[PDB]
Short mmCIF file of all heavy atoms in Angstrom, two decimals:
data_model
loop_
_atom_site.label_atom_id
_atom_site.label_comp_id
_atom_site.label_asym_id
_atom_site.label_seq_id
_atom_site.Cartn_x
_atom_site.Cartn_y
_atom_site.Cartn_z
N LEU A 1 -5.42 5.88 -16.34
CA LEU A 1 -5.52 6.00 -14.89
C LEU A 1 -4.17 5.77 -14.22
O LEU A 1 -3.80 6.51 -13.30
CB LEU A 1 -6.56 5.02 -14.36
CG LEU A 1 -7.01 5.25 -12.91
CD1 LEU A 1 -7.38 6.70 -12.70
CD2 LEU A 1 -8.17 4.34 -12.56
N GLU A 2 -3.43 4.76 -14.67
CA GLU A 2 -2.11 4.50 -14.10
C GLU A 2 -1.14 5.64 -14.39
O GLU A 2 -0.37 6.06 -13.52
CB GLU A 2 -1.56 3.18 -14.64
CG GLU A 2 -0.17 2.83 -14.15
CD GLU A 2 0.54 1.85 -15.07
OE1 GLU A 2 0.38 1.98 -16.30
OE2 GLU A 2 1.24 0.96 -14.56
N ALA A 3 -1.17 6.16 -15.63
CA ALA A 3 -0.28 7.25 -16.00
C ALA A 3 -0.59 8.52 -15.23
O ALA A 3 0.31 9.32 -14.95
CB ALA A 3 -0.36 7.51 -17.50
N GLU A 4 -1.86 8.75 -14.90
CA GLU A 4 -2.21 9.89 -14.07
C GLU A 4 -1.82 9.67 -12.61
O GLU A 4 -1.31 10.58 -11.95
CB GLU A 4 -3.70 10.19 -14.18
CG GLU A 4 -4.16 11.38 -13.36
CD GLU A 4 -5.51 11.91 -13.80
OE1 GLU A 4 -5.86 11.72 -14.98
OE2 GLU A 4 -6.22 12.51 -12.96
N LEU A 5 -2.05 8.45 -12.10
CA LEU A 5 -1.78 8.16 -10.70
C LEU A 5 -0.30 8.31 -10.38
O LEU A 5 0.09 9.07 -9.48
CB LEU A 5 -2.26 6.75 -10.37
CG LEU A 5 -2.27 6.33 -8.89
CD1 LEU A 5 -3.60 6.67 -8.25
CD2 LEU A 5 -1.95 4.85 -8.75
N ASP A 6 0.56 7.62 -11.14
CA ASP A 6 1.97 7.59 -10.79
C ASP A 6 2.65 8.94 -10.96
O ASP A 6 3.73 9.15 -10.41
CB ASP A 6 2.71 6.52 -11.61
CG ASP A 6 2.67 6.80 -13.10
OD1 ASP A 6 1.97 7.74 -13.52
OD2 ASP A 6 3.35 6.07 -13.86
N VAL A 7 2.04 9.86 -11.71
CA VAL A 7 2.60 11.19 -11.88
C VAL A 7 2.04 12.17 -10.85
O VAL A 7 2.77 13.01 -10.33
CB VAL A 7 2.36 11.68 -13.32
CG1 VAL A 7 2.70 13.16 -13.46
CG2 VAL A 7 3.17 10.86 -14.31
N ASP A 8 0.75 12.06 -10.53
CA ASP A 8 0.12 13.06 -9.67
C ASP A 8 0.24 12.72 -8.19
O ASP A 8 0.59 13.59 -7.38
CB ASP A 8 -1.35 13.22 -10.05
CG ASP A 8 -1.53 13.80 -11.44
OD1 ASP A 8 -0.51 14.05 -12.12
OD2 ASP A 8 -2.69 14.02 -11.85
N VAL A 9 -0.05 11.48 -7.79
CA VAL A 9 -0.16 11.16 -6.38
C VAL A 9 0.90 10.16 -5.92
O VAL A 9 0.79 9.61 -4.83
CB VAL A 9 -1.57 10.64 -6.04
CG1 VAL A 9 -2.62 11.68 -6.40
CG2 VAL A 9 -1.84 9.34 -6.76
N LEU A 10 1.92 9.92 -6.74
CA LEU A 10 3.01 9.03 -6.36
C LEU A 10 4.38 9.69 -6.42
O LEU A 10 5.25 9.33 -5.63
CB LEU A 10 3.02 7.78 -7.24
CG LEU A 10 1.98 6.70 -6.94
CD1 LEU A 10 2.38 5.38 -7.58
CD2 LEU A 10 1.77 6.53 -5.45
N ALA A 11 4.58 10.65 -7.32
CA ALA A 11 5.84 11.37 -7.42
C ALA A 11 5.92 12.56 -6.48
O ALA A 11 6.95 13.24 -6.45
CB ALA A 11 6.06 11.84 -8.86
N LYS A 12 4.86 12.83 -5.72
CA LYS A 12 4.86 13.93 -4.76
C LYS A 12 4.44 13.48 -3.36
O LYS A 12 4.13 14.32 -2.52
CB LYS A 12 3.93 15.06 -5.23
CG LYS A 12 4.27 15.61 -6.60
CD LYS A 12 3.36 16.78 -6.95
CE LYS A 12 3.54 17.20 -8.40
NZ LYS A 12 2.26 17.17 -9.16
N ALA A 13 4.43 12.17 -3.10
CA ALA A 13 3.95 11.63 -1.83
C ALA A 13 5.11 10.96 -1.10
O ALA A 13 5.79 10.11 -1.67
CB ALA A 13 2.82 10.64 -2.06
N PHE A 14 5.31 11.36 0.15
CA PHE A 14 6.28 10.68 1.01
C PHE A 14 5.60 9.47 1.63
O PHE A 14 4.47 9.56 2.11
CB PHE A 14 6.79 11.64 2.09
CG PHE A 14 8.09 11.21 2.71
CD1 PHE A 14 9.28 11.37 2.01
CD2 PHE A 14 8.12 10.67 3.98
CE1 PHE A 14 10.48 10.98 2.58
CE2 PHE A 14 9.32 10.28 4.55
CZ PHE A 14 10.50 10.43 3.84
N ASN A 15 6.31 8.33 1.63
CA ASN A 15 5.73 7.04 1.99
C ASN A 15 4.54 6.71 1.08
O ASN A 15 3.39 6.64 1.49
CB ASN A 15 5.31 6.99 3.47
CG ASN A 15 6.34 7.59 4.39
OD1 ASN A 15 6.09 8.58 5.07
ND2 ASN A 15 7.53 6.99 4.43
N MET A 16 4.87 6.53 -0.20
CA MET A 16 3.86 6.35 -1.23
C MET A 16 3.14 5.01 -1.16
O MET A 16 2.14 4.83 -1.85
CB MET A 16 4.47 6.53 -2.62
CG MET A 16 5.25 5.32 -3.12
SD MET A 16 6.54 5.77 -4.29
CE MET A 16 7.05 4.16 -4.87
N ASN A 17 3.63 4.06 -0.35
CA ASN A 17 2.93 2.79 -0.22
C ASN A 17 1.60 2.91 0.52
O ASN A 17 0.82 1.96 0.52
CB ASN A 17 3.83 1.75 0.46
CG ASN A 17 4.19 2.12 1.89
OD1 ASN A 17 3.69 3.10 2.45
ND2 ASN A 17 5.08 1.34 2.49
N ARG A 18 1.33 4.05 1.15
CA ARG A 18 0.09 4.28 1.87
C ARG A 18 -1.01 4.86 0.98
O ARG A 18 -2.13 5.07 1.47
CB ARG A 18 0.32 5.21 3.06
CG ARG A 18 1.39 4.73 4.03
CD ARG A 18 0.82 3.71 5.00
NE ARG A 18 1.74 3.37 6.07
CZ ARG A 18 1.36 2.90 7.25
NH1 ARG A 18 0.08 2.72 7.55
NH2 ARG A 18 2.29 2.59 8.16
N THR A 19 -0.73 5.13 -0.29
CA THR A 19 -1.72 5.70 -1.20
C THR A 19 -1.74 4.99 -2.54
O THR A 19 -2.22 5.56 -3.53
CB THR A 19 -1.47 7.19 -1.40
OG1 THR A 19 -2.40 7.71 -2.36
CG2 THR A 19 -0.06 7.44 -1.89
N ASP A 20 -1.25 3.76 -2.61
CA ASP A 20 -1.22 2.98 -3.84
C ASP A 20 -2.33 1.93 -3.82
O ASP A 20 -3.08 1.79 -2.85
CB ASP A 20 0.15 2.33 -4.02
CG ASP A 20 0.47 2.06 -5.48
OD1 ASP A 20 -0.39 2.33 -6.34
OD2 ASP A 20 1.59 1.57 -5.76
N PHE A 21 -2.45 1.20 -4.92
CA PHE A 21 -3.42 0.12 -5.01
C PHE A 21 -3.01 -1.04 -4.12
O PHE A 21 -1.84 -1.20 -3.76
CB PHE A 21 -3.58 -0.34 -6.46
CG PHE A 21 -4.11 0.71 -7.39
CD1 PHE A 21 -3.49 0.96 -8.60
CD2 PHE A 21 -5.22 1.46 -7.05
CE1 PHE A 21 -3.98 1.93 -9.46
CE2 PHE A 21 -5.72 2.43 -7.90
CZ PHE A 21 -5.09 2.67 -9.11
N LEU A 22 -3.98 -1.88 -3.76
CA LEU A 22 -3.76 -2.94 -2.79
C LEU A 22 -3.59 -4.32 -3.42
O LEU A 22 -2.69 -5.06 -3.03
CB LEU A 22 -4.91 -2.99 -1.78
CG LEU A 22 -4.85 -1.94 -0.66
CD1 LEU A 22 -5.97 -2.16 0.34
CD2 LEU A 22 -3.50 -1.98 0.02
N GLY A 23 -4.44 -4.69 -4.37
CA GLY A 23 -4.39 -6.00 -4.98
C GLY A 23 -3.45 -6.08 -6.16
O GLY A 23 -2.63 -5.19 -6.40
N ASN A 24 -3.57 -7.17 -6.91
CA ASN A 24 -2.81 -7.33 -8.15
C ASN A 24 -3.45 -6.49 -9.24
O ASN A 24 -4.66 -6.56 -9.46
CB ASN A 24 -2.77 -8.80 -8.56
CG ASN A 24 -2.34 -9.72 -7.43
OD1 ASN A 24 -1.16 -10.03 -7.29
ND2 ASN A 24 -3.30 -10.16 -6.63
N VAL A 25 -2.63 -5.70 -9.93
CA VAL A 25 -3.12 -4.73 -10.91
C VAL A 25 -2.81 -5.23 -12.31
O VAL A 25 -1.67 -5.61 -12.61
CB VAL A 25 -2.49 -3.35 -10.67
CG1 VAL A 25 -3.06 -2.33 -11.64
CG2 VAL A 25 -2.71 -2.90 -9.24
N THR A 26 -3.83 -5.24 -13.17
CA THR A 26 -3.69 -5.59 -14.57
C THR A 26 -4.14 -4.41 -15.43
O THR A 26 -5.18 -3.80 -15.15
CB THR A 26 -4.51 -6.84 -14.92
OG1 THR A 26 -4.23 -7.87 -13.97
CG2 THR A 26 -4.16 -7.33 -16.32
N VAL A 27 -3.36 -4.10 -16.46
CA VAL A 27 -3.59 -2.92 -17.29
C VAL A 27 -4.12 -3.38 -18.65
O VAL A 27 -3.49 -4.20 -19.32
CB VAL A 27 -2.31 -2.09 -17.46
CG1 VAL A 27 -2.57 -0.87 -18.31
CG2 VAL A 27 -1.76 -1.68 -16.10
N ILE A 28 -5.27 -2.84 -19.04
CA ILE A 28 -5.88 -3.13 -20.33
C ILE A 28 -6.22 -1.82 -21.03
O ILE A 28 -5.88 -0.74 -20.53
CB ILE A 28 -7.13 -4.02 -20.19
CG1 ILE A 28 -8.23 -3.27 -19.44
CG2 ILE A 28 -6.79 -5.33 -19.50
CD1 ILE A 28 -9.62 -3.73 -19.79
N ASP A 29 -6.88 -1.90 -22.18
CA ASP A 29 -7.23 -0.72 -22.96
C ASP A 29 -8.58 -0.12 -22.58
O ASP A 29 -8.95 0.92 -23.13
CB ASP A 29 -7.22 -1.06 -24.45
CG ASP A 29 -8.18 -2.18 -24.81
OD1 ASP A 29 -8.80 -2.75 -23.89
OD2 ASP A 29 -8.31 -2.49 -26.01
N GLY A 30 -9.31 -0.73 -21.66
CA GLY A 30 -10.58 -0.20 -21.20
C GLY A 30 -11.76 -1.05 -21.63
O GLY A 30 -11.65 -1.94 -22.48
N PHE A 31 -12.90 -0.76 -21.02
CA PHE A 31 -14.14 -1.49 -21.25
C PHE A 31 -15.06 -0.72 -22.18
O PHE A 31 -14.82 0.44 -22.53
CB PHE A 31 -14.84 -1.77 -19.92
CG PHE A 31 -14.06 -2.66 -19.00
CD1 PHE A 31 -13.56 -2.18 -17.80
CD2 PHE A 31 -13.82 -3.99 -19.33
CE1 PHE A 31 -12.83 -3.00 -16.96
CE2 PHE A 31 -13.10 -4.81 -18.49
CZ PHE A 31 -12.61 -4.32 -17.30
#
């Protein structure tokens, strides 16, 4: 999810802080 987000909706967005996550983010291998 992070690898898709930062490539699709962060590398093409001006003022990218308006479309990012809000809280503290922790990355795991999934549930």
Side-chain angles (χ1 to χ4, degrees):
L1 194 49
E2 178 202 39
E4 180 163 334
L5 189 90
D6 62 353
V7 170
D8 294 2
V9 301
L10 284 198
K12 303 183 189 124
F14 200 75
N15 316 118
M16 78 207 189
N17 64 7
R18 304 278 189 156
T19 176
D20 206 358
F21 297 132
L22 281 185
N24 310 267
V25 183
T26 310
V27 181
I28 65 153
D29 59 356
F31 296 113

